Design a protein around this ligand. Structure first.
Ligand SMILES: CCCCCCCC/C=C\CCCCCCCC(=O)O[C@@H](COC(=O)CCCCCCCCCCCCCCC)COP(=O)([O-])OCC[N+](C)(C)C
Ligand SMILES: CCCCCCCCCCCCCCCCCCCC(=O)O[C@H](COC(=O)CCCCCCCCCCCCCC)COP(=O)(O)OCCN
Ligand SMILES: CCCCCCCCCCCCCCCCCCCC(=O)O[C@H](COC(=O)CCCCCCCCCCCCCC)COP(=O)(O)OCCN
Ligand SMILES: Nc1ncnc2c1ncn2[C@@H]1O[C@H](COP(=O)(O)OP(=O)(O)OP(=O)(O)O)[C@@H](O)[C@H]1O
Ligand SMILES: *[C@@H]1O[C@H](CO)[C@@H](O[C@@H]2O[C@H](CO)[C@@H](O)[C@H](O)[C@H]2NC(C)=O)[C@H](O)[C@H]1NC(C)=O
Ligand SMILES: [K+]
Lengths: 335, 205, 61
């Protein structure tokens, strides 16, 4: 019940499906690659989750370190203020509860250090865990800071916005046929070194056995200097005449109603503000190829300055066209 | 007055007589592995593998089976059951005591959530093709096992009655952890640090 | 410098020579694995040989 498989959906996104793949694995370096690029919703969570985790973990470590040295006994049980004089043997001055260890870990890692919970020189394990906690805190801090700067570097690029018309046409220009779509642009910055390429996708057997299933020929776009470049501010019409060398040369008015054609168009180039290459692609199955229809004039010189009227981006009007073939039209004068 | 993980009784934290021969310090030590596994396995599962290598359409539930998978689910469900029993015994005992004495059941609850996270981690790391990470899990068990042992043996030195509910209930956890450790070891050969074939075969939908 | 992983363009183990469209043809297979596409690609095929010149100079490579 499904329609013929399309090579490229209207929103680019070549929908091929590679199977029989020699699946390597992950290498555990994939996680960091994913982490550097997340939607901002998450990178205000993994920040909080990392900081809060590390804090709590080192808090429990301080709790056990103090607990096993007998400090908590000396604080809790012995006299509160007067009946007891500290033996100075304590490991971490004035941390007599878990919450105290939390308010010590925060101090020891966010570099606050209020100074009501000092580090004495008795318990060597305490100094060891202090070195370890400080090192871990710095490593996490640098990684998170670099992640935040990376996700502030990519605030310029948003999305490829280059708009091709819905359905193409085929008309008459200078006594010869053609085939036209309509490219366009939206945002402020122009394109730089823009290029256009037209490929026709077909299943073309050969007289020598080979039958390439999905094979893609390239066809030229009309231009008086044979250069595939284009400089666009208002929408252009990148025509591509048909001739004996061209593959569409055997197309027909009625056969196109049931035919296997696939004219993908790709457009490449950079943008001045971003300074990043980019490209956009689309395809035109036979069902959305009209005939005789030509595109409409869109630019009208108003009183002050030129105006491009997007109101009729893809509107088409019928005009004279012959129902014969390209080879019929070019076969003979009388033809 | 607030929570007292060692009992709000003076000298219940007096560690002068012995270093680890205390009722609550053993409980806290047993607690530590969960508060490590959760905080080393929360974000790793949170930030899943999102890089692009070959394509997006992966074989759904590709490696549906895993080496030794048959025991895992049932064993971990039994672990959840025994954690439930432990928390129940602690909570029923709690009302008789004076203070909160969180040492009775806080480790049990932390282990409950840790075991659930372990199941989730196993399923989310096995179904997708990423066993090189699974090695981390093994460490947990070792750690946990040791702490559990560090409890039980001491009880024998205290010689709690065999007919007592608490000792009998807590006994089986060590054996369950040992069986889980063996299960984790048995799939050690295909994916590990070294000297293994590490053969790669895709599995059909 | 963590966006990169490694090269992902794959060639055939062996070549092929045949007859296509009436004349002899040389073949080779090229494939890609990375999901992201490769824009503005180009290929070049060169013959490396030890040569001779009528004047006498010989270029090894
Ligand atoms: C929600 C009301 C207060 C909210 C403050 C946040 C801290 C709550 C935990 C808490 O009450 O500490 C308790 C333990 O608590 C534990 O044992 C937690 C187990 C380890 C933490 C692992 C991650 C969770 C107190 O533990 P303690 O300090 O050893 O008690 C002796 C100190 N004292 C003698 C003064 C009573
Ligand atoms: C916060 C979010 C953190 C997310 C995880 C980041 C892990 C980055 C690991 C990068 C890496 O590939 O190095 C690996 C070490 O892993 C590690 O050391 C992990 C440390 C991560 C700390 C953050 C293996 O390194 P290698 O195998 O290439 O080197 C072998 C030469 N003997
Ligand atoms: C907290 C501290 C704020 C400090 C300044 C942070 C500014 C940068 C935040 C990025 C931002 O615009 O927030 C967007 C939505 O925020 C939110 O939706 C906030 C949620 C809570 C609102 C109350 C998430 O960025 P995004 O996911 O929408 O963009 C990616 C798709 N292109
Ligand atoms: N299914 C696949 N998935 C990923 N890469 C492949 C696959 N098949 C072949 N390759 C790559 O193509 C190259 C040559 O492959 P070839 O056509 O010789 O198949 P092969 O004889 O099985 O290759 P090899 O002998 O290296 O296993 C190799 O470097 C290999 O990495
Ligand atoms: C908790 O505080 C109570 C206060 O009464 C301590 O009471 C002990 O009760 C036994 C019963 O014979 C006696 O040894 C003493 O009355 C107390 N034991 C001592 C001083 O060693 C009790 O010591 C505290 N809990 C624990 C486990 O020591
Ligand atoms: K500071």
């Amino acid at each position: 019940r499904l329609p013929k498989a399309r090579f490229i959906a209207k929103s680019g996104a070549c929908n091929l499906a590679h199977k029989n793949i020699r699946e390597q694995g992950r290498f555990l370096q994939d996680i960091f690659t994913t982490l550097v690029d997340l939607k901002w919703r998450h990178t205000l969570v993994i920040f909080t989750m990392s900081f809060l985790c590390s804090w709590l973990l080192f808090a429990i470590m301080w709790w056990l370190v103090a607990f096993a040295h007998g400090d908590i006994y000396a604080y809790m049980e012995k006299g509160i203020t007067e009946k007891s004089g500290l033996e100075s043997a304590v490991c971490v001055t004035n941390v007599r509860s878990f919450t105290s260890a939390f308010l010590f870990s925060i101090e020891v890692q966010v570099t606050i250090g209020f100074g009501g919970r000092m580090m004495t020189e008795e318990c060597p394990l305490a100094i060891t865990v202090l070195i370890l906690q400080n090192i871990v805190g710095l490593i996490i801090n640098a990684v998170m800071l670099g992640c935040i700067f990376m996700k502030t570097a990519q605030a310029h690029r948003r999305a490829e916005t280059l708009i091709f018309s819905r359905h193409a046409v085929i008309a008459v220009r200078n006594g010869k046929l053609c085939f036209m779509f309509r490219v366009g642009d939206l945002r402020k910055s122009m394109i730089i070194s823009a290029s256009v390429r037209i490929q026709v996708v077909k299943k073309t057997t050969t007289p020598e056995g080979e039958v390439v299933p999905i094979h893609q020929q390239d066809i030229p776009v009309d231009n008086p200097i044979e250069s595939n470049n284009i400089f666009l501010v208002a929408p252009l019409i990148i025509c591509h005449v048909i001739d004996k060398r061209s593959p569409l040369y055997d197309i027909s008015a009625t056969d196109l109603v049931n035919q296997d054609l696939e004219v993908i168009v790709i457009l490449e180039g950079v943008v001045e503000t971003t300074g990043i290459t980019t490209q956009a692609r689309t395809s035109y199955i036979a069902e959305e190829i009209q005939w005789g229809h030509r595109f409409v004039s869109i630019v009208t010189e108003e009183e002050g300055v030129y105006s491009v009227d997007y109101s009729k981006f893809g509107n088409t009007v019928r005009v004279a066209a012959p129902r014969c073939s390209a080879r019929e039209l070019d076969e003979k004068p009388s033809i | 007055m607030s929570l007292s993980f060692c009992g709000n009784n003076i000298s219940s934290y007096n560690i002068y007589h012995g270093v680890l021969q205390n009722p609550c310090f053993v409980d806290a030590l047993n607690l530590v592995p969960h508060v490590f596994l959760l905080f080393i396995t929360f974000p790793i599962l949170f930030i899943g593998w999102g890089s692009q290598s070959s394509k997006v359409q992966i074989h759904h539930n590709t490696w549906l089976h895993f080496p030794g998978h048959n025991l895992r689910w049932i064993l971990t469900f039994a672990l959840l059951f025994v954690h439930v029993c432990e928390i129940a015994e602690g909570i029923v005992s709690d009302s008789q005591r004076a203070s909160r004495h969180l040492h009775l059941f806080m480790p049990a609850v932390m282990g409950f959530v840790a075991t659930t996270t372990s199941i989730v981690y196993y399923h989310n790391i096995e179904t997708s093709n990423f066993p090189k990470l699974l090695l981390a899990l093994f460490l947990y068990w070792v750690m946990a096992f040791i702490t559990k042992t560090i409890k039980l043996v001491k009880y024998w030195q205290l010689g709690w009655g065999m007919s007592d509910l608490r000792f009998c209930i807590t006994g089986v956890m060590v054996i369950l952890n040992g069986l889980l450790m063996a299960v984790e070891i048995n799939v050690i050969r295909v994916r590990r640090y070294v000297f293994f074939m590490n053969p790669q075969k895709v599995k059909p939908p």
